[PDB]
């Protein structure tokens, strides 16, 4: 995340997926070396929303890191679309518009998968 307090910048929004992941990584590389009550109020809720989104990366085992892969069967009811179909014919904002009727259910399912994964290695 690229801000004075740290939060991601829109690196190359109009770029289609296959280049935009590369620019997400180069976003990271340049971003961390680039790093009256209105200002205080705004950056306190910036802290609050930041710690919120890092707790979403916290409770999926992702520990506050990008490109964090977890083990969920991505249902064809959420999207029947093929990989290269969306990953070379689309950008990211219209795909978030596509699946904004599922994001609470996706956070639901990744949380059962993370607690299931840690409870199973808690067994093993």
């Amino acid at each position: 995340g690229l801000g004075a307090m740290i939060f991601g910048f829109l690196g190359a929004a109009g770029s289609t997926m296959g280049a935009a992941s590369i620019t997400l990584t180069v976003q990271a590389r340049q971003l961390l070396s680039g790093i009256g009550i209105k200002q205080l109020q705004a950056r306190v809720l910036a802290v609050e929303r930041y710690l919120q989104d890092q707790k979403f990366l916290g409770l999926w085992g992702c520990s506050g890191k990008i490109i964090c892969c977890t083990a969920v069967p991505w249902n064809s009811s959420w999207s029947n679309k093929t990989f290269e179909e969306i990953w070379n014919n689309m950008t990211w904002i219209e795909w978030e518009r596509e699946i904004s009727n599922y994001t609470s259910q996706i956070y639901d399912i990744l949380t059962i998968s993370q607690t299931q994964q840690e409870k199973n290695e808690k067994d093993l």
Partner: nanobody, 130 residues
């Protein structure tokens, strides 16, 4: 609020050409709003024809190269007005026509999707007989 009217009911000759207006009393522009031209055969269900959407005129492959749509937005005496024009009205073109504006500003509302869109506020439908 938004309201739509258009031209009246016109009956013409086979092999004529027709134009149908679209006066949008409430559209702040047709830059951000988009309008849609939809036919309806007598009794038969409604069929899409064409649209204007950020000043890209389009019609269907059932209407490419024969039917033409225009739009001039908000001027002084005139509200934003589109217009559907058809040459060579066959007996198939005997239909009720429709103009409808959609709000395309807040991109995550879901009334629209990348050119195609759900049609917010209709007019009165115009009979055209051949």
């Amino acid at each position: 609020q938004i309201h739509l009217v258009q031209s009246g009911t016109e009956v013409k000759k086979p092999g004529s050409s027709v134009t149908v207006s679209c006066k949008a009393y409430g559209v702040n522009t047709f830059g951000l709003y988009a309008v849609n031209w939809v036919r309806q055969a007598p009794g038969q269900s409604l069929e899409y024809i064409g649209q204007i959407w950020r000043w890209k005129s389009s019609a269907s492959h059932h209407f490419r190269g024969r039917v033409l749509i225009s739009a001039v937005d908000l001027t002084g005496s005139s509200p934003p007005i589109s217009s559907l024009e058809i040459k060579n009205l066959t007996s198939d073109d005997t239909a009720v026509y429709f103009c409808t504006t959609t709000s395309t500003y807040d991109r995550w509302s879901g009334l629209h999707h990348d050119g195609v869109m759900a049609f917010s506020s209709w007019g009165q439908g115009t009979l055209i007989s051949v």
